[PDB]
Write a protein that binds this ligand. Structure first.
Ligand SMILES: Cc1c([C@@H](C)NS(C)(=O)=O)cnn1C
Length: 185
């Protein structure tokens, strides 16, 4: 792809983080802690899952960023509406305001309803995310495999400002402690 020139500097919004997350000083990395991280509760925090939002809000234009997923067993990545539900149980779907892909149990899937199987020959260590607000497109690229396309959501109905979306996943297995990292431009 040739989307690299729309690169944006994403930082994580601490206030939105699940209370077990640990965000680095530079707000560019996030991992699952082994306990509650001693923060107060607020209406922004994702309560049921290890999720956090980017601080940036996008309502126009073309945006691109990259995320490192090295050695993780489970994660979700993409964008979501600023107005998504924070509390309780919900599924990742465009109807609920999410445009995402994930890794779970050795398979990659797009967060449609129902979910769509992805066809990835080279397991990615870094993912590129491209948003074209006006076109209604969210695309995912395999940076490990020369930028090959993973998935395109088209005909998106964003219906609001968009925020970068992250889920570091649970670590019930002891094999999913590694962080998500926003990669340098
Ligand atoms: C839902 C959950 C957590 C984190 C992600 N949520 S919480 C309770 O900190 O809001 C840890 N164990 N469980 C079962």
């Amino acid at each position: 792809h040739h989307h690299h020139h729309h690169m944006v500097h994403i930082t994580l919004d601490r206030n939105t983080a699940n209370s077990w997350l640990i965000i680095s000083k530079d707000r560019r990395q996030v991992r699952m802690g082994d306990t509650h991280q001693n923060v107060s509760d607020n209406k922004e925090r994702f309560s049921n899952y290890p999720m956090v939002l980017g601080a940036q809000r996008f309502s126009s234009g073309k945006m691109y960023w990259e995320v490192d997923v090295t050695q993780k067993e489970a994660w979700d990545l993409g964008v979501c509406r600023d107005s998504v539900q924070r509390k309780g149980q919900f599924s990742l779907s465009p109807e609920n305001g999410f445009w995402t892909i994930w890794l779970w149990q050795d398979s990659y899937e797009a967060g449609t309803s129902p979910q769509t199987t992805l066809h990835i020959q080279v397991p990615p260590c870094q993912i590129g995310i491209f948003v074209d607000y006006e076109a209604g497109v969210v695309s995912f690229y395999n940076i490990t495999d020369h930028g090959s396309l993973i998935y395109t959501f088209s005909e998106c109905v964003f219906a609001g400002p968009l925020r970068p979306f992250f889920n570091v996943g649970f670590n019930y297995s002891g094999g999913n402690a590694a962080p998500l990292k926003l990669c340098p431009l």
